[PDB]
Design a protein around this ligand. Structure first.
Ligand SMILES: Nc1ccn([C@H]2C[C@H](O)[C@@H](COP(=O)(O)OP(=O)(O)OP(=O)(O)O)O2)c(=O)n1
Ligand SMILES: [Mg+2]
Ligand code: NA
Ligand SMILES: [Zn+2]
Lengths: 325, 243, 1111, 47, 94, 8, 142
DNA sequence: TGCATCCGTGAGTGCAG
DNA sequence: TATAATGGGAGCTGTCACGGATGCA
């Protein structure tokens, strides 16, 4: 910590002086409307009346039409979104929007697309989408009517962040109540029961096993404690050992190789500590990437860890979480 | 009241009277409003403001706030040097502003040495709406937040405010510095990832200087000898970074 | 300077009078300007006509009158009175048996009056009555959420003027009915109306589906007045069903146009709905002995034909703006009036049948008080009577045009779901879709569209030009939502030759869906784009380049614009900046043509052509509701020749008649070393120098001196134990001298109260025994100044009693008020904002030698940070700078109409023309290109901003038109590696300043029952450390820091006192005992007969009251 | 001694009486003239 | 960060046991006038006043540095409590 | 259910 | 939202805390009675001890809301939700809150049983060697 | 016995108020 | 303290979702 503290101010000092001198700015001219645009805008109306004509000659219904009217416009948006980044990376790799969204300093492709590309399909109060999209950009400028249509979207979205917030809160609170007495009360409960964390997902795409996504495996493994030995790729991971981040990455490899399918871990799903949990069944105190210290209020940490994200969970969304808890 | 039948209303209003159970229960009841968390002495609030000059473990506490939040300590120190004879006269000095003499503040700076305060920001969603800082006194009214800790707090500078609480006991200090100081809490307790990390300007800065130009002039000629490629370049026909 | 316009849209009509919804409304309820004979039965009148006449003796209503107010508008503002008129009403008593005639005009109280601008004065504070939105009276059908094929019908009157009723056709064939949630077969009711089996099939006769199911002759075997008693049993389980009591209960619910009123609206809506004329606003009639139905069968007709499939039977959209409607201020108060009147009528008839049935007049049969009180109520504790928002003049105007869904009559917050808040199709051009608050009230409180008006029925309607053939008429008509839906309506800006639709594709709406249609098919055309948005929203230049969610912040944030002492209108305007200063009725204009006689910081007198010599006095330095100096300044000079409607003084936040919400500043958009971080803002010290973003503020500090059961409180200059230095600014009496400087600690008004039965105790009687002064009998209760407040005493008001004109609340001798002022420079912490939603706190004020600056020596004023723009998506502030660049060097301001403004070419044109001034000035004044401008140009070329191989002038030209310039860091002279966006921005100082919000307490007040610290800056609060903060400490495991919070810092009275003694003694704080609030928890469970008990580990009790509650 | 548990249970009529320091006999608060507590009412000091 | 923290957490079996050892030692000092310190004058934490450098007052900074030396003993059930709260009021008075 | 109508 | 599985488990584990009886063997329990999985496992040992029959039980899954309300500590439950229903049933049964958890001790205001307050660490002593040997030598001879 | 149906209970933080 | 007088009066309305206890083919 002590050094990472000094490391951190360091990256703070230089990163900050640099931003200023290097001379990043934003002028209207910096939302570059890729010329690929009207190729894609024109290519659309033709394929639109190419389905206003498999209905104009009554070929198939309105409930079929609207459906393919916005399967078109969605994969149109995708095209010109790409065109906005190809046009950036190949020709202005240092233009400020590109730079900002790219490093992770601000923006993401979808907003940026509305500065340069087109705004997209908008929502109708009900929940259905207007088949008429707003073709304008924000650089280009919206027609009054375009602007209005676009408003049902945001109002319905504000309302949402307001009712939602009240349930996250309420939810968070139930979570604290049902776990507050959980503390890391003892060192080992001697429990001889554990859990298999599957590295493989019983698919139905191939309904074979597909390896599980890295971060989701990190999620079930980082900072655990083995409850049996493991021997994979000439390495010996012992009973008792706290999987360090690298311990994890090695186990994925060995799984990619076929030597392992599910790590046996000491989880709190099974500590026999009364009114708390042992150190072993817990694992690392993630705030310190090291074994948890007896007396951490891990229940409260849990509750906080799970509540704090729901705000911030857009549908199902947070509902489905509440349906489960 | 109101549990069964109509509720007991004073005359000329429709406000149910507040019965014994109504006191005990509800978000406004005795439990959730006075037992699971009270108001507190030694605490302040103010508008925050980025201070990029701070070290990770620091913050900008305006000095008018400082005085009050430490007022006892400042009365005792004010004696041990002698900007007043006894503590009671010491207090009457600071009660009108004029009467504050310069070496009052020098006196304060002794007071708060070493000890930290707490910053709290609006929704304490997780263990980190509260973190510990050594205050550095400043003029002006605003609190100075360190930029790296803005993320945990979800604190921008659209005019957010923050709470200050002074720990008191030698225990409440030793808790704040060891366990709750910012510089010690750098990894998230939820994912174990880092949480004091670079964000907006800080990475914008380091990106810009570690990126690399990719020039389009030379278009990738095939020159068999350096000595002429250079020549080509001092000819102006091939840009410096073209591959 | 020149004011270049853009915009091709010739707007036909202008904005209508922007407070008409407040003023037109109240006046159409008072009629205090109509000869009573000529009045008409709406508003204050209609209420009289409704409650009168009173019945057995009888007392009938002749006419009312209204007298002018006993004190003029300003006199009530000072003396904390109400601006109200006396209400007289002439009556005539007449005896139900003999022919008695007496006639007095009895006095009913005071009705408060509305000022010129739309406000009210109520105990001397201006207030606004927010019109309320509610579902409107009428009859509706909406499908049953359970049975996908059966449909509830509902019948709804005005609020509290009748019951709701549903006609859900049950799963047992025969149709139901709900009243006070009491269901029963509809049939029983039709009977009571004199209905016959046959004349049902004679009217239904089509849907043997249920027409034949509706009929069940366990009912038909009865005459009309037979089921009349049948059903009185169904709704009164217990009351004796006498044929005098049942005709009274039904009637008093369904045919009594005295507690059942459909709207005047409700009539027409149910009329056109069921296509039947309607005698009166009432479901049933009593006429010729029995009941004659009016509304039940028509409603029953619709519902049936719908549940089969008939045409022309659509469910209704209760969120349509034809089925919602506005209870304007006048209607809202006559409601409260119609409830005071009805209470007075419980008070006459009571004294009409007890006390003497012949020696009686109107004068003494009427107790005015039930009326006086319901009026005092409406204006002093309604949800809809809000403290006025006179921060700046826009705030007062935006307020008057607010629309709450909430309040008495509408929605409880919990009752508010989604459909209420959504932007509805029919909002288009009636309610703004932007202007609404973020937070829990989102979509309930909204704003009136700018061209929109409320018709006499309470619906909002918006204007439209009529197109015939394809030519567009100058004849405008305002439609309700409902009729709009009948037409195809072209877009504001569909392009025209002269007045013919010049395109072949026209952009039009048909019932709010967008349709592409030929000019043959086009019936109406929007008047303007200004007609779709709030006033405030119409103040946002370049709105069409601004994502909606920040347009909204730039909209609201304006009403928070503190008025600045050097305020200026925005260099880039939208065209409303002038009307707003007008209808805001805060600036001051010319009544007729004339010449100007005198002029002065205090008054402006003008000779007119009429010879009249008007003398407009100047509201100079008046304290607004929100503390913001409401200051009127003069804009003419002696003898100036003034045509009509010209200006004579600028109101606050108005410059030569334009809404000056803030200042125009030279802004650079570039990270600056961390002081930009997360919307923070860096400013040039050169701003405080020229007094930019400075504002004047005032706080009232009031004190009373009252008669006591221990003596009188005394306003004296004679305060015990206080040094003359500590009084050197107080007059003989104990008032600070007007013009002093007062700071925290300073006495503003000395005062003395008498000490108690703790008159000096022994400890104290001795300390004085040594000092030669004996115990003094009075006490210093002087009004000091609060921590972090102060300024320059500008006035004082001293009201005793025993002086003329004055009489205060009982037992109070004298009340002294001292108004204090401050000149508020901008300082580090205050909030700045622009009209696009860029908001941030001043985080740093560099001295001018550090500001980025242009080659020609000029330093910027504001360094905003570009990281604000991308994720925020509000590009307008980008354009607003570029066109601000041009303006800065041409010396021009611009008017860019919303959605019809200056576009990119038109503006890059203006930048060229500026470049000439900025650089051509140069290469002649003896200087060429600069060595750093090349190094930057070198870079610009790698970027792609400039065409390589062109004269530097050519390239700098090219950068300019991209709104970018070379910038030298003032800390080095070296140039910014890049070319920066630099321009001219409109940026307001918001109301939220560090000065008003820094606060801290060591220890202070506590609460009576809890002994936990009080809360709030003004009480000298403590900070609430909540459940969520406790969790925080819990997760850290700071047991001792948390415990501290829960004992010595809050309410552990023992260890709290013990601690503060420990600090001032230099000792560590002591381990704590039980919080006092827990004791309250014990005692409060005893009072509920529960025996809570602290116990030690060996199970024997433990007294946490140290024996003080055992015997 | 030191608290270690907290028991909650019904108060018998005789127990309610155990706690009490006097039957509040009158529905009176405090004397409209001396602003002091009427005896035998809700604020009486002998109770 | 706190100077030397990373090694502090190394000594104790659980971070919270450091916190109380620090806070306890750090109050042993506040009451005794520091006479019992196990430092030497040049290791003495020192703050800088407007007049001149002086002994650091913050008994907690002391206690932490104090702990790094290794000159202190920590652990459960090592003394009678009353035989320390006097033998230390003996070796160094109040 | 309603304490007046009862006494009535 | 990267978030460690162990947190969600901690909670879920509390949803699973409880069990329904399905034959009381030789005990005072009753078919249908609910109780903590802990407390049944507890006495099913005292019953495999006195060698009599064991309680037949059955796993119970409760949502979080109902699981907080069913906690032992009535001080925790009354301070959460459904305050009377909690409060009465407790007083009838003359429940005693053991003060085992956090809320409990927060309402009383005592040092919570976590962090610096865990019994594992709160009784720790610290003595300077210049005082650990000063008291060890007078106390080596009576 | 299974399943309507009613009644009672909840519905985020702090700050200004 | 004495003609006679003998059953009230306002409801309020647009949320929601879950869990438990009661009524009914
Ligand atoms: N009822 C409220 C209102 C505000 N907030 C807090 C939460 C956030 O701290 C901030 C809301 O986030 P914002 O929308 O203001 O903007 P962000 O800075 O969080 O995201 P971005 O950087 O894109 O603007 O205010 C909250 O928790 N609850
Ligand atoms: Mg913020
Ligand atoms: Na932000
Ligand atoms: Zn275990």
């Amino acid at each position: 910590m002590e050094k990472t503290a000094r490391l951190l101010d360091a990256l703070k000092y230089y990163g900050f002086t640099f931003s200023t001198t290097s001379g990043i700015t934003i002028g209207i001219d910096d939302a570059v409307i890729p010329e690929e645009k009207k190729q894609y805008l024109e290519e659309a109306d033709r394929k639109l009346l190419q389905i206003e004509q498999a209905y104009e000659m009554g070929f198939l219904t309105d409930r079929e039409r609207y459906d393919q009217i916005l399967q078109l416009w969605t994969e149109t948006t995708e095209k010109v979104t790409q065109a906005v980044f190809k046009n950036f990376e190949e020709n202005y790799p240092f233009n400020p929007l590109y730079v900002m969204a790219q490093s992770g300093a601000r923006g993401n492709p979808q907003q940026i697309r509305q500065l340069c590309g087109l705004r997209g399909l908008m929502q109708k109060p009900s929940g259905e989408t207007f088949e008429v999209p707003v073709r304008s950009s924000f650089r280009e400028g919206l027609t009054v009517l375009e602007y209005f249509i676009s408003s049902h979207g945001a109002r319905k979205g504000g309302a949402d962040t307001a009712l939602r917030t009240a349930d996250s809160g309420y939810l968070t609170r139930k979570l604290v109540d049902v776990t507050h007495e959980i503390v890391v009360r003892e060192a080992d409960c001697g429990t001889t029961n554990y859990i298999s964390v599957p590295l493989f997902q019983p698919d139905e795409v191939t309904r074979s096993l597909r390896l599980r996504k890295r971060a989701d495996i990190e999620a079930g493994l980082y900072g655990r404690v083995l409850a049996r030995e493991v021997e994979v790729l000439g390495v010996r991971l012992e009973e008792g050992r706290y999987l360090s981040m690298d311990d994890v990455h090695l186990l994925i490899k060995a799984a990619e190789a076929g030597e392992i399918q599910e790590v046996p871990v000491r989880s709190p799903l099974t500590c026999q500590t009364r009114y708390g949990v042992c150190q072993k069944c817990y694992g690392y105190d993630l705030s310190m990437a090291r074994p948890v210290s007896i007396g951490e209020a891990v229940g409260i940490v849990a509750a906080q860890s799970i509540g704090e994200p729901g705000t911030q969970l857009t549908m199902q969304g947070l509902p489905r979480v509440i349906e489960l808890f | 009241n109101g549990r069964r039948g109509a509720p007991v209303t004073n005359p000329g209003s429709d406000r149910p009277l507040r019965s014994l159970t109504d006191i005990l229960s509800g978000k406004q009841g005795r439990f959730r409003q006075n037992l699971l968390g009270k108001r507190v002495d030694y605490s302040g609030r103010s508008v925050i403001v980025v201070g990029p000059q701070l070290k990770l473990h620091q913050c900008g506490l305006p000095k008018r706030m400082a005085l009050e939040l430490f007022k006892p300590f400042l009365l005792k120190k004010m004696e041990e040097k002698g900007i007043a004879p006894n503590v009671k006269a010491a207090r009457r000095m600071l009660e009108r502003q004029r009467d504050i003499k310069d070496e009052v503040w020098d006196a304060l700076e002794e007071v708060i040495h070493g000890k930290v305060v707490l910053l709290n920001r609006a929704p304490t969603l997780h263990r980190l709406g509260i973190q510990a800082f050594q205050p550095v006194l400043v003029e002006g009214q605003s609190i100075q937040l360190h930029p790296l800790v803005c993320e945990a707090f979800n604190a921008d500078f659209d005019g957010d405010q923050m709470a200050v609480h002074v720990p008191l006991s030698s225990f409440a200090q030793a808790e704040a510095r060891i366990q709750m100081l910012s510089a010690h809490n750098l990894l998230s307790p939820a994912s174990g990832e880092p949480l004091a990390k670079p964000s907006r300007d800080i990475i914008l800065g380091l990106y810009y200087i570690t990126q690399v130009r990719k020039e389009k002039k030379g278009a990738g000629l095939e020159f068999a000898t350096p000595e002429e490629a250079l020549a080509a370049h001092e000819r102006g026909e091939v840009a410096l970074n073209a591959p | 300077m020149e004011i270049k316009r853009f915009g091709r849209i010739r707007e036909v009509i202008p904005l209508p009078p922007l407070t008409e919804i407040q003023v037109e409304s109240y006046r159409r309820a008072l009629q205090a300007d109509v000869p009573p004979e000529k009045r008409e039965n709406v508003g204050i009148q209609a209420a009289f006509r409704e409650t009168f006449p009173i019945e057995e003796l009888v007392l009938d209503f002749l006419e009312y009158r209204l007298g002018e107010p006993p004190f003029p508008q300003d006199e009530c503002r000072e003396k904390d009175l109400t601006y109200q008129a006396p209400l007289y009403a002439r009556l005539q008593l007449i005896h139900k048996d003999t022919g008695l005639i007496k006639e007095d005009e009895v006095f009913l109280g005071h009705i408060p009056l509305m000022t010129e601008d739309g406000s009210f004065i109520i105990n001397g504070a201006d207030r606004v009555i927010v019109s309320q939105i509610h579902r409107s009276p009428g009859v509706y059908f909406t499908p049953d959420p359970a049975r996908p094929g059966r449909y509830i019908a509902s019948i709804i009157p005005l609020p509290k003027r009748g019951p709701w009723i549903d006609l859900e056709v049950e799963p047992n064939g025969v149709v139901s009915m709900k009243v006070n949630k009491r269901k029963f077969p509809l049939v029983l009711l039709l009977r009571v109306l004199g209905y016959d089996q046959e004349t049902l099939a004679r009217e239904l006769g089509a849907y043997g589906e249920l027409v034949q199911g509706l009929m069940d002759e366990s009912v038909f075997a009865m005459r009309p007045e037979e089921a009349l008693i049948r059903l009185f049993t169904l709704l009164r389980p217990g009351d004796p069903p006498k044929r005098d009591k049942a005709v009274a209960y039904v009637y008093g619910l369904i045919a009594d146009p005295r507690r059942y009123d459909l709207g005047e609206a409700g009539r027409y809506k149910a009329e056109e709905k069921l296509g039947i004329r309607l005698s009166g606003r009432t479901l049933a009639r009593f006429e010729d002995g029995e009941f004659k139905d009016e509304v039940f069968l028509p409603t029953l007709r619709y519902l049936f034909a719908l549940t089969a499939g008939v045409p022309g039977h659509e469910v209704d959209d209760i969120d349509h703006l034809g089925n919602r409607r506005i209870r304007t201020v006048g209607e809202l108060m006559t409601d409260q009036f119609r409830v005071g009147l009805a209470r007075l009528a419980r008070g006459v008839r009571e004294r009409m049948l007890m006390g003497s049935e012949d020696s009686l007049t109107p004068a003494k049969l009427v107790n005015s008080r039930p009326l006086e009180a319901a009026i005092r109520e409406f204006f002093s504790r309604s949800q809809l009577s809000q403290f006025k928002d006179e921060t700046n003049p826009l705030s007062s105007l935006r307020h008057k045009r607010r629309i709450s869904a909430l309040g008495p009559g509408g929605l409880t917050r919990e009752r508010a779901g989604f459909d209420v808040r959504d932007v509805h199709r029919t909002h288009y051009g009636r309610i703004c879709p932007v202007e609404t608050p973020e937070g829990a009230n989102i979509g309930l409180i909204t704003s009136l569209a700018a061209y929109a008006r409320v018709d006499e029925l309470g619906f909002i309607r918006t204007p439209y030009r009529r197109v015939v053939g394809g030519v567009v008429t100058d004849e405008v008509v305002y439609m309700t939502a409902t009729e709009e839906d009948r037409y195809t309506i072209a877009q504001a800006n569909t392009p025209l030759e002269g007045n013919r639709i010049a395109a072949e594709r026209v952009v039009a709406r048909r019932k709010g869906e967008p349709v592409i249609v030929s000019p043959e098919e086009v019936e109406f055309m929007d008047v303007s784009p200004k007609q779709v948005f709030s006033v405030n929203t119409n103040l946002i230049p370049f709105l069409e380049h601004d994502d909606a969610n920040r347009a909204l912040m730039g909209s609201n944030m304006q009403t928070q614009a503190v008025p600045l002492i050097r305020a200026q209108a925005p260099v880039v305007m939208t065209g409303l900046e002038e009307r707003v200063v007008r209808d805001s009725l805060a600036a001051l204009y010319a009544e007729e043509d004339g010449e100007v006689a005198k002029v002065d910081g205090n008054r402006i007198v003008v000779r007119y052509e009429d010879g009249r010599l008007v003398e407009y006095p100047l509201r100079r330095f008046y304290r607004s509701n929100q503390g913001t100096a409401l200051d009127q300044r003069p804009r003419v000079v002696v003898g100036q020749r003034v045509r009509k409607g010209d200006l004579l003084a600028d109101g606050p936040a108005s410059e030569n008649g334009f809404l000056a919400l803030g200042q125009n500043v030279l802004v650079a958009i570039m990270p600056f070393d961390g002081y930009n971080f997360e919307d923070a803002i860096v400013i040039s010290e050169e701003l405080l120098k020229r007094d930019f973003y400075t504002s004047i503020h005032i706080e009232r500090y009031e004190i009373e001196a009252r008669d006591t059961k221990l003596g009188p409180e005394r306003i004296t200059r004679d305060i015990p134990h206080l040094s003359e230095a500590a009084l050197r600014d107080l007059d003989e009496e104990g008032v600070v001298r007007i013009g002093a400087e007062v700071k925290p600690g300073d006495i503003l008004v000395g005062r003395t109260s008498f000490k108690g039965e703790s008159e000096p105790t022994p400890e104290e009687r001795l300390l004085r025994s040594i000092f030669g002064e004996k115990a003094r009998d009075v006490k210093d209760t002087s009004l000091r100044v609060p921590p972090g407040e102060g300024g320059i005493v500008v006035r004082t008001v001293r009201l005793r009693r025993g002086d003329p004109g004055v009489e205060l609340k009982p037992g109070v001798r004298e009340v002294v008020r001292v108004y204090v002022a401050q000149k508020r420079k901008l300082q580090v912490g205050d909030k700045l904002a622009n009209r696009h939603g860029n908001k941030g706190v001043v985080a740093k004020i560099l001295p001018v030698e550090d500001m980025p600056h242009l080659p020609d020596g000029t330093p910027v004023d504001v360094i905003l940070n570009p990281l604000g723009v991308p994720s925020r998506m509000n590009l307008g502030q980008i354009l607003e700078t570029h066109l601000g660049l041009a303006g800065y060097f041409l010396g021009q301001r611009y008017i860019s109409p919303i959605f019809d403004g200056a576009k990119e070419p038109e503006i890059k044109e203006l930048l060229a023309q500026a470049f000439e001034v900025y650089f051509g000035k140069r290469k002649g004044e003896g200087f060429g290109v600069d060595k750093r401008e090349v190094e930057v140009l070198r870079r610009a070329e790698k970027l792609g901003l400039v065409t390589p191989g062109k004269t530097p002038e050519e390239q700098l030209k090219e950068l300019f038109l991209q709104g970018k310039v070379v910038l030298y860091d003032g800390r080095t002279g070296e140039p910014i590696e890049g070319p920066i966006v630099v321009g001219q921005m409109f940026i307001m100082k918001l109301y939220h300043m560090v000065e008003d919000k820094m606060h801290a307490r060591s220890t202070g007040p506590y609460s009576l029952i809890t002994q936990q610290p009080l809360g709030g800056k003004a009480q000298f609060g403590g900070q609430r450390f909540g459940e969520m903060e406790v969790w925080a400490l819990e997760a850290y495991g700071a047991a001792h820091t948390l415990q501290e919070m829960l004992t010595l810092k809050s309410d552990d009275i023992e260890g709290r006192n013990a601690a503060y003694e420990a600090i001032i003694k230099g000792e560590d704080v002591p381990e704590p005992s039980v919080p006092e609030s827990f004791r309250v928890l014990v005692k409060e469970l005893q009072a509920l007969a529960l025996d809570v008990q602290t116990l030690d580990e060996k199970d024997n009790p433990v007294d946490i009251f140290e024996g003080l509650a055992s015997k | 001694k030191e608290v270690r548990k907290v028991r909650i249970a019904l108060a018998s009529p005789e127990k309610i009486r155990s706690w009490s320091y006097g039957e509040v006999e009158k529905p009176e608060t405090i004397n409209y003239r001396t602003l002091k507590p009427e005896r035998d009412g809700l604020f009486d000091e002998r109770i | 960060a706190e100077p030397g923290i990373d090694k502090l957490f190394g000594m104790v079996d659980s971070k919270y046991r450091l916190t109380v050892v620090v806070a306890k030692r750090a109050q042993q000092l506040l009451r005794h006038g520091f006479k019992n310190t196990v430092l030497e004058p040049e290791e003495r934490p020192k703050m800088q006043t407007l007049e001149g450098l002086f002994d650091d007052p913050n008994a907690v900074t002391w206690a932490m540095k104090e702990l790094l030396t290794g000159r202190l003993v920590f652990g459960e059930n090592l003394v009678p409590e009353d035989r320390l709260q006097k033998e230390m009021e003996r070796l160094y008075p109040v | 259910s309603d304490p007046v109508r009862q006494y009535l | 939202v990267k978030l460690h599985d162990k947190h969600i488990e901690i909670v879920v584990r509390q949803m699973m805390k409880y069990v329904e009886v399905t034959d009381p063997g030789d005990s005072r329990l009753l078919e249908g009675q609910v109780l903590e999985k802990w407390d049944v496992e507890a006495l099913n040992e005292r019953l495999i001890a006195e060698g009599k029959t064991p309680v037949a039980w059955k796993p119970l899954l409760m949502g979080v809301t109902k699981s907080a309300l069913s906690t032992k500590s009535w001080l925790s439950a009354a301070s959460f939700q459904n305050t009377t229903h909690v409060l009465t049933e407790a007083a009838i049964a003359g429940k005693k809150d053991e003060l085992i958890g956090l809320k409990e001790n927060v309402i009383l205001g005592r040092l919570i049983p976590a962090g610096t307050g865990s019994d594992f660490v709160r009784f720790t002593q610290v003595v300077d060697q210049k005082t650990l040997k000063a008291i060890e030598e007078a106390r080596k001879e009576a």
